C-alpha cells in the first residue's frame, strides 16, 4: 500500500471508500466534491 | 379467540407449561452431552440443571412469532454480556452451537421443519390452559383456580 499522489506508504492513508488520497493530503488534494460543513 | 403469546405472557409461563409437557412426556429428545456451556462466554456451568429445559419452546415461540429463522437468527434470543472478557471492554455475541440440535428436536414431533414453523401448532391448544390453569395462585377470576 503505497498510495496515490506520493511514495508515502505512510501518513496512514484512508482506505475508506477505496479513494486513496492521503499521499498529498485530502486537504491539498480536493475538488473530489467534499465540503467543509459541520 | 386465542393466539400464540399474546394472550399469555409467555415469559416464564407459555414456556414452562410447555416444559413439563416436554419433560414429563417421554416423547422428546435431549442429546447426550450436557457438560458443555450453552451460551456466550459462560464459564459458569451451563446452569444449575435442566439445560435444554430452558431451550426448546424458545425455538418454538422463536419460530412462531418470528416466522422464518435459523441457526444464525435465533441466537439473537440467546443473550449474553459475553463478559468474562479479560481486562478489556466487554462485547456481545450469540451462540450458533447447540442451535442445530435444538431445532432438530422440533424436526421431529409434529412441528414443521427444514423451512417453516409448525404443523398443527399445538402451542395454542396445549397452551390454551394457561389462563385456565394457573401455577402461581393465578388469580384469573373467583371462578377459576
Amino acid at each position: 500500500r503505497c498510495c496515490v499522489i506520493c511514495s508515502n506508504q505512510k501518513a496512514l492513508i484512508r482506505k475508506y471508500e477505496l479513494n486513496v488520497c492521503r499521499q498529498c493530503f485530502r486537504e491539498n488534494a480536493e475538488h473530489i466534491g467534499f465540503t467543509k460543513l459541520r | 379467540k386465542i393466539h400464540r403469546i399474546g394472550k399469555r405472557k409467555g415469559a416464564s409461563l407459555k414456556d414452562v407449561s410447555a416444559w413439563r409437557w416436554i419433560k414429563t412426556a417421554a416423547r422428546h429428545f435431549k442429546q447426550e452431552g450436557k457438560i458443555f456451556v450453552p451460551n456466550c462466554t459462560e464459564i459458569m456451568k451451563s446452569s444449575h440443571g435442566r439445560e435444554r429445559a430452558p431451550q426448546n419452546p424458545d425455538w418454538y415461540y422463536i419460530r412462531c412469532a418470528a416466522v422464518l429463522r435459523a441457526i444464525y437468527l435465533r441466537p439473537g434470543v440467546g443473550y449474553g454480556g459475553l463478559s468474562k472478557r479479560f481486562g478489556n471492554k466487554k462485547n456481545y455475541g450469540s451462540r450458533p452451537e447447540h442451535t442445530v440440535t435444538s431445532s432438530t428436536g422440533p424436526l421431529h414431533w409434529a412441528c414443521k421443519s427444514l423451512t417453516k414453523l409448525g404443523l398443527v401448532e399445538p402451542g395454542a391448544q396445549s397452551g390454551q390452559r394457561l389462563t385456565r390453569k394457573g401455577h402461581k395462585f393465578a388469580d384469573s377470576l373467583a371462578f377459576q383456580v
Binding site: - | 450436557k34 457438560i35 458443555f36 464459564i43 459458569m44 451451563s46 444449575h48
Partner: protein
C-alpha cells in the same frame, strides 16, 4: 433438618471448608466451577447440596477418587487439564500438589528460553500489549527492571 455433623472435610489432600454448597467447596481441590458439573458424573445424584452427604450420602470416598483418573468415570477429554502431554500421555487431571511438581519441571523451559511478551510473561509484567509502565496504580508492586 438433621445434620449429624459439619466440619472441614479433607477431600484430596486438602482442607475444604464445609460450605452449604458442595461444588463451590469442592472448588478448593484444584477442580474449578466448570469441573463441578462433574458433581453429576462424579456419580452423585443429590442436588443443591448441604454438608449432608459427602461420604454420608455421596459415599463421598468415591467422588474424590473421580477427581483423579476420571476416564474410569463418564467424562469427556475436552475438560481434562493436561490433555496430551510432553513427557507422557495425559494425566486427565491437574489436581492437588501434582500440579506444581510438574510445574517445577515445566516452569524451567519457557522462562528459561527467551521471549518478548513471554519473558515479560516469565516476569509476569503485562498480558497483551505494549504498556508496561503507568500500568500499576493504587499500590506497590508491579514490574521492575534491574541490571545493576
Amino acid at each position: 433438618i438433621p445434620d449429624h455433623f459439619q466440619h472441614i472435610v479433607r477431600l484430596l489432600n486438602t482442607n475444604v471448608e464445609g460450605k452449604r454448597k458442595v461444588p463451590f467447596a469442592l472448588r478448593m481441590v484444584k477442580g474449578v466451577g466448570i469441573r463441578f458439573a462433574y458433581l453429576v458424573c462424579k456419580k452423585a445424584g443429590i442436588d443443591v447440596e448441604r454438608r449432608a452427604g459427602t461420604l454420608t450420602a455421596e459415599e463421598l470416598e468415591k467422588i474424590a477418587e473421580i477427581i483423579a483418573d476420571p476416564a474410569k468415570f463418564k467424562i469427556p477429554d475436552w475438560f481434562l487439564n493436561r490433555q496430551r502431554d510432553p513427557k507422557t500421555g495425559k494425566t486427565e487431571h491437574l489436581s492437588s500438589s501434582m500440579v506444581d511438581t510438574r510445574l517445577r519441571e515445566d516452569l524451567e523451559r519457557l522462562k528459561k528460553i527467551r521471549a518478548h511478551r513471554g519473558v515479560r510473561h516469565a516476569y509476569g509484567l503485562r498480558v497483551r500489549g505494549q504498556h508496561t509502565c503507568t500500568t500499576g496504580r493504587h499500590g506497590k508492586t508491579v514490574g521492575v527492571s534491574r541490571g545493576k
